[model samples]
Target: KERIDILFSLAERVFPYSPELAKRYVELALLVQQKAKVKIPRKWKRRYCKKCHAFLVPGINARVRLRQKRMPHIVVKCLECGHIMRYPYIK
Candidate 1:
């Protein structure tokens, strides 16, 4: 694409002294474009608990809450059974 070409050209100019660095930039540009195609939105939905048939709630009062080990994702905890689930944003 034209954008990719432009990116490679700019990278070539910026890293003119280092062909390796220029190649890295070109590869990074391609990777970024590929990753962008699969990027999801930033909104999540409430996950209902199967065992208790209730909507999951956050342990703390906040617009969004995430698990300790989780990043770039949201968590919903079941009030009835302490069930936890991860939901990706889809805005």
Candidate 2:
């Protein structure tokens, strides 16, 4: 638990200048998950690129859009790898 949290924060801090290293931190977190058989917290889980594994910072490397055309939902587009993540929200 401690290790995973530390790794996640470290990656967020390192993402601004060196995204490559930040990616490595994410990798470490994933490795820790596999070895420890623990699920990563959802708060941190939604903050990174699922495909590229890049740490996401709103208005930096990620674009967030809220759409209510169909149902209320938040769309997150990862700028680094151009991946889209959608999560529904409640009013």
Candidate 3:
């Protein structure tokens, strides 16, 4: 729990300076989460690229778009790996 927070904070803090370093932090968090077998904190969710493990900083390495063709949702695209994740939202 604490490790995740620390790792994520470090990732966020160091992202502006160097992105690879931040991505490494997320990789470490994923490793910890894998061994610990526990879900990451809520606020930490949807903050990284699942496909390539890239740290997602909106308008930097990721793109966010809203759509309402059927149900209201936001489409997130990871520019690093071209992976897409769509999450629905409530009105």
Writing each residue's lDDT as its tens digit, candidate 2 over 23-59 gives: 7777777777678788766745667677667777766
lDDT per residue as tens, model 3, 1-91 = 7877787777777666665566677778777777877785554556678765657776655678987776688987765576777778987
Against the unseen true structure, what C-alpha lDDT does each candidate score? 0.45, 0.73, 0.71
Best by TM-score: 2
| Ranked candidates, highest lDDT first | 2, 3, 1
Which candidate model has the greater TM-score, 1 or 2?
Answer: 2
lDDT of 1 at 72: 59
Top lDDT model: 2
RMSD from true fold, candidate 3: 3.0
Worst 10 residues of 1 by lDDT: 39-48
How are the candidates ranked when ordered by TM-score, highest leading? 2, 3, 1
**How far off is residue 49 in model 1, in Å?**
1.6
Comparing 2 with 3 on lDDT, the higher-scoring candidate is 2
